[PDB]
Amino acid sequence: TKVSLEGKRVVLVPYMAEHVPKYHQWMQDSALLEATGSEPLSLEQEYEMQLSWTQDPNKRTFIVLDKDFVKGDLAHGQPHVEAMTGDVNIYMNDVDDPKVAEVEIMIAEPRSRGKGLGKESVLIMMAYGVKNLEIHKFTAKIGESNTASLSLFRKLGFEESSYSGIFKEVTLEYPVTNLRREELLKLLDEVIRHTH
Numbered sequence: 001t002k003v004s005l006e007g008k009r010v011v012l013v014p015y016m017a018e019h020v021p022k023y024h025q026w027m028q029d030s031a032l033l034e035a036t037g038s039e040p041l042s043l044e045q046e047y048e049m050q051l052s053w054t055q056d057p058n059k060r061t062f063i064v065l066d067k068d069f070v071k072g073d074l075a076h077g078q079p080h081v082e083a084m085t086g087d088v089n090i091y092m093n094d095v096d097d098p099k100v101a102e103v104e105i106m107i108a109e110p111r112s113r114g115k116g117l118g119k120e121s122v123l124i125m126m127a128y129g130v131k132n133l134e135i136h137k138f139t140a141k142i143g144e145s146n147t148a149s150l151s152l153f154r155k156l157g158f159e160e161s162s163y164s165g166i167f168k169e170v171t172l173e174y175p176v177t178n179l180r181r182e183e184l185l186k187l188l189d190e191v192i193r194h195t196h
């Protein structure tokens with residue numbers, strides 16, 4: 001990824017080595033680890049994953065910045081550690097269909113929760129996938145007790161498609177209908193790109 005994406009309240013920037021120390025600190029929250037799909041890493045592994053995640057052709061990943069905390073402009077590829085808030089990604093992980101993508105979202109900083117940053121970050125990333133990856137269905141895998149994430153995805157219009165009692169995990173789907181495709185592309189048309 002060579003660009004960052006500026007919406008109304010968030011900037012989605014490429015995950016950089018400069019972001020790793022704060023990201024690693026977020027991941028010390030066992031609740032965050034369990035709520036996301038994450039295993040605890042060493043710092044070494046966290047740095048190596050920054051390189052591998054961002055080189056993976058089947059993934060798109062961004063660090064979420066809260067625009068209220070950004071100091072300086074978005075035009076020079078700077079990491080803006082001071083505004084780091086979370087992450088968002090899509091993974092094309094369906095062997096049967098390269099136009100299906102799984103979504104993940106995390107807003108790790110309490111000071112930035114409840115401002116609509118998770119919703120906007122997911123919508124921008126979904127729209128990016130529709131335009132550039134031709135995604136026609138998104139999925140989300142959510143722990144059965146994760147009230148906050150279940151609410152977010154359902155309020156976006158994701159619908160439950162299956163449940164694993166073994167893993168205590170709900171899977172939701174978002175078919176990209178003609179109307180949703182139009183809406184998402186219009187939204188992305190208003191997102192400012194910066195070279196990064």
Ligand SMILES: CC(=O)SCCNC(=O)CCNC(=O)[C@H](O)C(C)(C)COP(=O)(O)OP(=O)(O)OC[C@H]1O[C@@H](n2cnc3c(N)ncnc32)[C@H](O)[C@@H]1OP(=O)(O)O
Binds near residue numbers: 143152153
């Ligand atoms: C598919 C996956 O990624 S599963 C893993 C999801 N990530 C996590 O669980 C990490 C821990 N939690 C988080 O990161 C955050 O709580 C998130 C991402 C779930 C929500 O981030 P926020 O930025 O606070 O959400 P945002 O402010 O954009 O609100 C969006 C919707 O989320 C829902 N929501 C957010 N927080 C809560 C909550 N505490 N309880 C219930 N619903 C909630 C609401 O429906 C809200 O819509 P409303 O504002 O109209 O009520």
